[PDB]
């Protein structure tokens, strides 16, 4: 419901930041703002946890307040740990 707390970190798990979206389309304005994108370049957004890729509001929705979120842009990869 609303605006809620999300973690983003880049790729290597080394920038690490905090948004505050209502949606999905907002997370990835957000996520390539706080990581220093393009806003016109295209990105993936997964979960950290097992690469989990999250594509829809509909996934989106279903996430917990603070959960941590990879931005991948250009060819990166999840990798574990």
């Given at each position: 419901?609303?605006?809620?707390?999300?973690?983003?970190?880049?790729?290597?798990?080394?920038?690490?930041?905090?948004?505050?979206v209502?949606?999905?389309?907002?997370?990835?304005?957000?996520?390539?703002?706080?990581?220093g994108?393009?806003?016109?370049?295209?990105?993936?957004?997964?979960?950290?946890?097992?690469?989990?890729?999250?594509?829809?509001?509909?996934?989106?929705?279903?996430?917990?307040?603070?959960?941590?979120?990879?931005?991948?842009?250009?060819?990166?990869?999840?990798?574990?740990?």
């Open positions: 419901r609303g605006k809620r707390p999300l973690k983003i970190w880049d790729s290597w798990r080394n920038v690490r930041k905090g948004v505050v209502g949606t999905f389309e907002e997370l990835l304005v957000r996520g390539k703002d706080k990581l994108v393009p806003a016109s370049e295209p990105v993936r957004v997964v979960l950290e946890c097992d690469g989990t890729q999250i594509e829809d509001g509909e996934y989106f929705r279903t996430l917990a307040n603070n959960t941590v979120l990879l931005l991948l842009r250009q060819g990166e990869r999840w990798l574990e740990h």
